[PDB]
Design a protein around this ligand. Sequence first.
Ligand SMILES: *[C@@H]1O[C@H](CO)[C@@H](O)[C@H](O)[C@H]1NC(C)=O
Ligand SMILES: *[C@@H]1O[C@H](CO)[C@@H](O)[C@H](O)[C@H]1NC(C)=O
Ligand SMILES: *[C@@H]1O[C@H](CO)[C@@H](O)[C@H](O)[C@H]1NC(C)=O
Ligand SMILES: *[C@@H]1O[C@H](CO)[C@@H](O)[C@H](O)[C@H]1NC(C)=O
Length: 752
Amino acid sequence: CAAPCSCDGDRRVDCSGKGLTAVPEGLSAFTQALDISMNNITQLPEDAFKNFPFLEELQLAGNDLSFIHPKALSGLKELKVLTLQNNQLKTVPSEAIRGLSALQSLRLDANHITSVPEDSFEGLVQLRHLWLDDNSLTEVPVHPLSNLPTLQALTLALNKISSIPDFAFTNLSSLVVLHLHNNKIRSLSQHCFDGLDNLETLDLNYNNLGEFPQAIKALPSLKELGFHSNSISVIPDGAFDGNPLLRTIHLYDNPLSFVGNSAFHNLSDLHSLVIRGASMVQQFPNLTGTVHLESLTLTGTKISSIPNNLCQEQKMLRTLDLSYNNIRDLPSFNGCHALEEISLQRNQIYQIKEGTFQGLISLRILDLSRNLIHEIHSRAFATLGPITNLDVSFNELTSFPTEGLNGLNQLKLVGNFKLKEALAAKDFVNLRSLSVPYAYQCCAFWGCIIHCTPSTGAFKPCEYLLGSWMIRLTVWFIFLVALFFNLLVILTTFASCTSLPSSKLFIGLISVSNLFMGIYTGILTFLDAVSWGRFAEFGIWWETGSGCKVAGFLAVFSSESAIFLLMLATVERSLSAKDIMKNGKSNHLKQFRVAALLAFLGATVAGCFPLFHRGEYSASPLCLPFPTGETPSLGFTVTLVLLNSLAFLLMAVIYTKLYCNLEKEDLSENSQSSMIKHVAWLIFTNCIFFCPVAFFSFAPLITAISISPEIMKSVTLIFFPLPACLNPVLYVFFNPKFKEDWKLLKRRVTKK
Ligand SMILES: *[C@@H]1O[C@H](CO)[C@@H](O)[C@H](O)[C@H]1NC(C)=O
Ligand SMILES: *[C@@H]1O[C@H](CO)[C@@H](O)[C@H](O)[C@H]1NC(C)=O
Ligand SMILES: *[C@@H]1O[C@H](CO)[C@@H](O)[C@H](O)[C@H]1NC(C)=O
Ligand SMILES: *[C@@H]1O[C@H](CO)[C@@H](O)[C@H](O)[C@H]1NC(C)=O
């Protein structure tokens, strides 16, 4: 073949991508096809193809062509395919292409053409396909297109066409497919499409059609119609009367609000129908004379009733979607043997009867989430086929049938807060994914393969409430010591019918306050003993029942009142000490008693606060407010922990102020030295035992520290109730005054 390009036999020359600026020479006149694309031929001289009389296929892609001689293409009587894409013609070379009698395919896209001469395309009696996209056309060339009776495919995409007048294609009797997508069409005249009796495919996507066109009524042979991504809002009745042969309708991405009831009648071959956002539709459409729907979708409407004949008329219905509507009752689905997917989420369905899903033998996915369902017949799913995915989440369910669900794979139950029963593992042997309203229902299918959610962490144990043996014995040790010692201390102080000083007074209520904490641990110990190895059964009942709220109230009330009381004792000790060298007598005894009642009131208010909020006490089976995986209490928990910690410093620095103001020689023999030293230990142990609880509560706010859940659980069971038992222990063994009171009690007991 002639240099620098190659000849692919069969009278074919591949001479493209060589940067040639002119028609190559040396090629035989017997050549049938020439491809010289990707070159730099910008101007074509006259008779540039003189010595190729038998050329049938000519390609001129990407040549930066600007000017063509009118007689340049003379003698190409056998030319059939002519491509001129990616050039700068800016106008259709009507004079150059006048003599192409046998031309069949003309490609003129991507040429920045802004206008077309009226005499263009004359002599193109053999044309079948014409490409005119990617240009700057502003009007439909009615007259130039009127001279192509044999045209079959016409593309005018990606242009600036604004409107189409009447009878624009009144000659294209042989047209088959017409493309007009990605244009600026905003108005279609009534008779713009007249004469296109042979048209089959029409594309009107990405336009500005504000009203449904009535001109499509004159297209009896239409098969594919697409006008999606437009401004059409209303589709009136009788729109598709003149086109009985559609197969696919594209109308998505439209401001569709109202649809004619009858509009989609007698649409044979209609294989799909998807309508979304039609908020004004209130009645189910007629879908009559249409028995070949494969997929149906009606979302965002006001439909409240579904006709019974839906499963008696539709034959090849495969997928059904009616979500986002006002459907309240469900008709019998018997007959829809080809149905596979049903989506009915976000409706007003309240019950499921036995006959609702009798006839579905090929159902695989069934969605009923976010409804008002409160009862389901036990045999509703009995007569089902290969059901694979089921979703009835966010409902008012109280029970759940299991018959016929052995083949289930995905199941969602979240939001059914009134559902208490635990699902049996033997009824869902093929389960792989499961979500349940309460984590305690995931204990059967831990997954030891079954991503059960929410995960049953250490905070929500399945086997044992307390967990390890070491933890359990300590809580028993704490409970017995707190109950026995606090009762003893309470009795001795209040059994002496003598004058009660303020310093002795605050000791008593601290023991009383710590007694309730011992009671709180008693509830946990007995609950653990009863639910030994079977806590998952009682988990739901305990948290949701009033038992958790009562136990949770005691823990908050006993803990908060303990800090407030001993803080008052610190203030009392400082004030009583000051009055010694100043006045020598304390006369605030009545005032302190009032503050003690006020101190208890503050604890009661704090204890009752989580009761008003829903689920704050139910976050953990321990009934303790903690930020771990709980926000309702996150705002509440921080308030308490800062309040307790804040109270520490003011009651601490006053002791240092008292200690500094107290001379070292005043503690030698004064009876106040023992009293001041006893509190000095209470401020110590209570402070250190509160930091681990306090600092773990700050852990969720610090993302840089990841603490595994079981660690918080162990310390909270060993440190939070620890001060309750330790406070009386120090008093009985280390306070010399208690021994004197013990002597007084023994004498009264012996006397009585
Ligand atoms: C094609 O060749 C001409 C020769 O004058 C040159 O001016 C032009 O830049 C070339 N085009 C490309 C794309 O190389
Ligand atoms: C082509 O269109 C012109 C103008 O509408 C008309 O006069 C002529 O008869 C048409 N030829 C046909 C329809 O074959
Ligand atoms: C469907 O076509 C039949 C036969 O032409 C006609 O009788 C019937 O009324 C049509 N459907 C509608 C739109 O009612
Ligand atoms: C469906 O079309 C038939 C045509 O005869 C009509 O009688 C019927 O009322 C229509 N139904 C609805 C609800 O559009």
